[PDB]
Design a protein around this ligand. Structure first.
Ligand SMILES: O=C(N[C@H](C/C=C/c1ccccc1)C(=O)O)c1ccc2ccccc2c1
Length: 113
């Protein structure tokens, strides 16, 4: 484990998310079920090669890191919500997580460093 990792992510918020708004939608109205369905659909297109993670995140992530194509930059432990932190540090660089759940919503994570 390095001191810090660098990750990008794709966040799909839902109406029960901690902050149910985003840069792309004044009010998040989708259900958590719908959010996980979207996340999984994203996972399958990225595995098939039909979509690129970073392009997907720059257009559809509910995180304002969309403008950075998903990049969150480097972080250490104790900074992010623990479920996000644990998944991130468990990835090898170049590896992509499965669905990851935080109070913010549902994420796909790509570790870059
Ligand atoms: O809270 C953020 N985004 C919120 C969404 C939650 C994002 C989030 C990220 C990691 C763990 C838990 C939640 C928003 O935009 O509404 C957030 C956090 C760290 C960032 C670092 C770099 C660039 C953008 C960033 C955006």
């Amino acid at each position: 484990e390095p001191a810090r990792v660098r990750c990008s992510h794709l966040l799909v918020k839902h109406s029960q998310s901690r902050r149910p708004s985003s840069w792309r939608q004044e009010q998040i109205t989708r259900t958590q079920e719908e959010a996980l369905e979207l996340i999984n659909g994203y996972i399958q297109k990225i595995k098939s090669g039909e979509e690129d993670f970073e392009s997907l995140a720059s257009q559809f992530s509910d995180c304002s890191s969309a403008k950075a194509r998903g990049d969150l930059g480097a972080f250490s432990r104790g900074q992010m919500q623990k479920p996000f932190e644990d998944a991130s540090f468990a990835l090898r660089t170049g590896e992509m997580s499965g669905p990851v759940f935080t109070d913010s919503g549902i994420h796909i994570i790509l570790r870059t460093e």
